[PDB]
């Protein structure tokens, strides 16, 4: 076209389209060719353009061939949220070559970048953003824990703990919530840097808490007792391939 | 008559998308995966009336998973397991 | 859609649920039970894939033989263990 | 310099084969079909059919060493009496050179080979008749033998078109014993080989098992010797709808 003209949020909903749909080259293609059309100076692009490139990038790698006990973003800065003057204006052709699940991590440090930036005014990050920034934590985590970056993993499975815990009490983020403390585990699991001390206590907390939860009877509880089975024979891996 | 045949093949091209198999060699891997599905379901058994449970469920594949199932093969194992029924649940 | 799919599994939960059924292991078998066992009896034969490809791959070979499952399980200490040789 | 009797040839390389010397059968083809005189002869089918059995064999034996598709094409049933684009003129039979059958891959060369037993076999009739009942029978033995190397070759599209071809021929028959148990095995196997492609959808997959189903079934009845066998066929079916069905709900 004459000077393609990019409406991001349609670009954005036919990018989940083709997501949805298990065509992950397309989708990414389609955030890589949106991003580098739009203009380079003056504009900060739609967050969710970098999270589905992400996911589809990941997906084609897959598809084809210390504790933060108390993360807290509330009282303590976010040392992982970079300034949008390191924000890539072009090029995103690159992310197609090399370390596909490092391609995916630094689109996904990036949509952290835009649903992270402080505002001018004092006024905080709504529950969205915060909500968002946990999904992409999580998202980070699972390619990490794919990726056999476990600590990394951990780190950010405990991050996305930190942002969800700062939302108003809801089904959704009680969800999200164990979702975390469940992930956490899964990753912990796999850590040999971590005493086993340190494990146990860790297990035991996340095993309470699903416990608690079932007892409130939830949607999920199949699922729910899933997590619960993992966590009990890891407890009693622990507990018994230690002092025996 | 090879029950898993068809799935391993695509499983290969999953993991291989450029690499063939002989029928012969499915053959032999049909055949573990028979072998491993029935020391599972038998442990499984075996476990079920132990606890004095008539029903086999997703636990008692998973107990039976980490005595059948060498070291880490197992670790996977059970993870993969957590995972296909939390997907399965959702 | 099938359960497989609902599960992210390529083996078959519906065949594997039956042959648990006809086996007679027990007086029910709950709805869990396959797409646990359909996930582990997958995850195993992608292992074993994985290794036989690379040994195929490692005999300059684009097809995979029985001589190439028998190295790929060898040489795995687990495999090895778990179906002997 | 020497002289060749094909029949008598035929039989020793048929003869081969039967004692599995796969080796020693494809050899007896080879040097039989390129010291024949270059020109005025169509040689006898058979040393075609037989050197692909025998280059096939001894791939399979020797790997297994130790220590699109048409949905109309499937959803018919009537005889295909139609041009068969698929025999080829005799001016592309291989004269010489039947060495390099043993080279490189050897079920890409036994299926040229077995394209030229179908090109001599199926070879139009001088006056316009069509051809004989042996002729059909053989072609279709020789569709199904694509089929089943295309399976182990993973062209599994062509594998199903090629038996979908044979049961058009055998369908051609007169009706006899022999000839209802290579279709009830055409049907089965065309059957079998569905469950290696995915671009078949539920549907067609689903009416193509209840007909094998319905025919296996109905040949259940007339009590066939081979009764084992056809109950095997008719429970993996049986398993093959169930699972199709299962997509359903």
């Known amino acids: ?244 | 008559k090879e029950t898993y045949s068809s799935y391993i093949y695509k499983v290969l091209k999953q993991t291989h998308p450029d690499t063939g198999i002989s029928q012969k060699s499915m053959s032999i891997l049909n055949s573990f995966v028979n072998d491993i599905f029935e020391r599972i379901a038998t442990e499984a058994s075996k476990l079920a009336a132990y606890n004095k449970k008539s029903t086999i469920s997703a636990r008692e594949i998973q107990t039976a998973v980490r005595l059948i199932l060498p070291g880490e093969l197992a670790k996977h194992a059970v993870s993969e397991g957590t995972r296909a029924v939390t997907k399965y649940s959702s | ?85």
Request: aromatic letters at 6%; a neutral charge; hydrophobic letters at 40%.
């Open chain 1, 1 to 244: 076209r004459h000077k393609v003209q990019i409406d991001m949020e349609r670009q954005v909903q036919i990018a989940k389209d083709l997501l949805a749909q298990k065509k992950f080259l397309e989708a990414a293609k389609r955030c890589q060719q949106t991003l580098d059309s739009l203009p380079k100076d003056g504009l900060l692009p739609d967050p969710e353009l970098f999270t589905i490139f992400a996911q589809a990038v990941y997906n084609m790698e897959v598809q084809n061939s210390h504790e933060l006990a108390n993360f807290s973003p509330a009282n303590e800065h976010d040392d992982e949220i970079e300034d949008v003057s390191q924000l890539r204006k072009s090029g995103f052709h690159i992310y197609f070559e090399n370390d596909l699940y490092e391609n995916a991590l630094d689109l996904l440090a990036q949509a952290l970048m835009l649903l992270g930036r402080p505002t001018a005014d004092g006024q905080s990050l709504t529950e969205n953003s915060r909500l968002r920034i946990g999904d992409v934590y999580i998202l980070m985590g699972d390619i990490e824990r794919e990726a056999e970056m476990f600590s990394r993993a951990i780190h950010h499975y405990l991050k996305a703990l930190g942002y969800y815990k700062t939302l108003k009490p809801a089904e959704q983020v009680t969800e999200k919530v164990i979702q975390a403390e469940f992930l956490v585990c899964d990753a912990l699991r796999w850590v040999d840097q971590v005493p086993a001390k340190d494990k146990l206590k860790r297990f035991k907390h996340a095993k309470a808490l699903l416990e608690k939860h079932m007892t409130t009877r939830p949607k999920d509880s199949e699922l729910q007792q899933a997590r619960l089975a993992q966590i009990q024979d890891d407890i009693d891996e622990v507990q018994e391939n230690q002092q025996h």
């Open chain 3, 1 to 85: 859609q099938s359960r497989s799919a609902k599960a992210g599994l390529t083996f078959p939960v519906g065949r594997v649920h039956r042959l648990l059924r006809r086996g007679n292991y027990a007086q029910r078998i709950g709805s869990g039970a396959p797409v646990y066992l359909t996930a582990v009896l997958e995850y195993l034969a992608a292992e074993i894939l994985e290794l036989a490809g690379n040994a195929a791959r490692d005999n300059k070979k684009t097809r995979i033989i029985p001589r190439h499952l028998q190295l790929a399980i060898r040489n795995d200490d687990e495999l090895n263990k778990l179906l002997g040789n």
